[PDB]
Structure 1
Amino acid sequence: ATCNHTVMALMASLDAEKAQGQKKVEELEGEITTLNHKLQDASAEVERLRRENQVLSVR
């Protein structure tokens, strides 16, 4: 009986541990996706600001 009970609880533990983990991984990928967009925007604003700095140096 003690063994049976322990199997039950571990199985529930392993599920819970997987759920909790996949939840956090996703939300970290979230952050990562968002940062990727932001880096992408500020890299174009640099590309732009830069290009127009050049047309500016011309006249």
Structure 2
Amino acid sequence: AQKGFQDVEAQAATCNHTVMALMASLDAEKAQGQKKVEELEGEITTLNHKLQDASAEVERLRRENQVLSVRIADK
């Protein structure tokens, strides 16, 4: 049954390698996931800034136009 011990010990070595491999994997996947999410975050941010610029121009115009209308009124 000692031969059995040898075969099993070996089986355990193999398994350990596989586990290490998976681990490297998971860690890697987490890294990738993290960076993609980071890209999207940044695109959402700049996206936002451009939307602020937009709404600002808008409110500004609404104001300048309201004013014009009023000026026309008193005329």
- Normalising by the residue count of structure 1, what TM-score does the alignment of the two structures yield? 0.91
Structure 1 stretches of 4+ moved >4 Å: none
Give 1 or 2: higher helix fraction: 2
Indicate whether 1:56 and 2:53 are aligned. no
Unpaired segments ≥5 residues, structure 1: none
Q: Over aligned residue pairs, what C-alpha RMSD do you find?
A: 0.9
Q: How many residues in Structure 1 have an aligned counterpart in Structure 2?
A: 59
- Normalising by the residue count of structure 2, what TM-score does the alignment of the two structures yield? 0.73
SS of the equivalent of 2:19 reads helix
Q: CA deviation at 1:2?
A: 1.6
Unpaired segments ≥5 residues, structure 2: 1-12
Aligned residue runs from structure 1 range 33-44, under 5 A: 33-44=45-56
Report percent identity of matched pairs: 100
- The residue aligned with 2:4 is none
